Amino acid sequence: GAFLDKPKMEKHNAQGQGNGLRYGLSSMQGWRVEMEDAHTAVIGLPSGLESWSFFAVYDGHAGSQVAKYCCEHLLDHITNNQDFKGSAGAPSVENVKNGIRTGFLEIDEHMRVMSEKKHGADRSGSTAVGVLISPQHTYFINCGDSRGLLCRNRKVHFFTQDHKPSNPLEKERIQNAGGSVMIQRVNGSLAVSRALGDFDYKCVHGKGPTEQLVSPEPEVHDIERSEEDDQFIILACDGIWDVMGNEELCDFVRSRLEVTDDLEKVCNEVVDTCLYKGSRDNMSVILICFPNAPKVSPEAVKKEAELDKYLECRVEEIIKGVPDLVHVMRTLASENIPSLPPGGELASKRNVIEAVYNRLNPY
Ligand SMILES: [Mn+2]
Ligand SMILES: [Mn+2]
């Protein structure tokens, strides 16, 4: 509803390891007056799914309630229904997919009844993007305009398709539910076509839960795992994707992993880079690395130290009536400095430039 006068740049982090996985995450409120993102990150699932893992980002809209509920309860709604637990043995691919769909519909209905019964005043909604990782499969899950991708063999192997109201099938559903897409928005208001919550958009008489103006139905994609070739998974809200493309962010993350194995720090760098690229939204990123993720390179670390020192010297010489940081950044940009991080560019080096600037002009 409003912007802060200065961004809240404080990072909240988590990290972990297990089942042959390493992960880090970072979330940051940014320019927004409230933090309405949430996330789930768990290696080892209950009830015979110890070798399974689950990661998810939730981008809350008009409040954090739906997102916060999801982040604590979506997983059990997915795994603790009859469709997921279908077969006698390990869940089949269909069990997993049907189980995920049922879990989204059932948590949505659960929240709706909780809200009706307790006379809930919030009209919040949430996206969800995540991965359910088994020994042999990565199941991508998407509902909304948060986004996930898989980097395999140094390339974007897969990314989720954002649910935008102007997408043909989304637009069709909206119109069949009595609504319209005005520019990019449901009835000129809502920027997503799919979400949990947003119950005001789920009141069309004579249409099922998945045929409302806004649908809680997730899209699920089974990717068979590749032990040799799988590198990393990125999950993030639109606060990240609004200012960095799939290949850019994939290239950027690779460049950062070649310099560090600290996954929280890599996530911090993504979020700061997007802030400095002009993102004014809440930002959350989860980075899940597989055994063959890029490795720290002695040469990359050396190039990074050389670049940092170079930037430090440039700031000094530009300072020489001292220019402010905005103007220093502008001057550095006009220098077309080579060997900046792919995708991240000068924005990804701002913390280094600003720390230099502060040392030289501390007042
Ligand atoms: Mn939000
Ligand atoms: Mn957002």
Swiss-Prot record:
One example GO MF annotation: R-SMAD binding
Residues reported in the UniProt entry to bind Mn(2+) 1: D59, G60
UniProt domain PPM-type phosphatase: residue ranges: 22-290
Reaction catalyzed: O-phospho-L-seryl-[protein] + H2O = L-seryl-[protein] + phosphate; O-phospho-L-threonyl-[protein] + H2O = L-threonyl-[protein] + phosphate
Keyword annotations of the record: Cytoplasm, Hydrolase, Lipoprotein, Magnesium, Manganese, Membrane, Metal-binding, Myristate, Nucleus, Phosphoprotein, Protein phosphatase
Subunit structure: Monomer. Interacts with SMAD2; the interaction dephosphorylates SMAD2 in its C-terminal SXS motif resulting in disruption of the SMAD2/SMAD4 complex, SMAD2 nuclear export and termination of the TGF-beta-mediated signaling. Interacts with SMAD2; the interaction dephosphorylates SMAD2 in its C-terminal SXS motif resulting in disruption of the SMAD2/SMAD4 complex, SMAD2 nuclear export and termination of the TGF-beta-mediated signaling. Interacts with the phosphorylated form of IKBKB/IKKB.
Protein name: Protein phosphatase 1A
Source organism phylogeny: Eukaryota, Metazoa, Chordata, Craniata, Vertebrata
Cofactor details (free text): Binds 2 magnesium or manganese ions per subunit.
Subcellular location, record wording: Nucleus; Cytoplasm, Cytosol; Membrane
CDD domains cross-referenced by the UniProt entry: PP2Cc
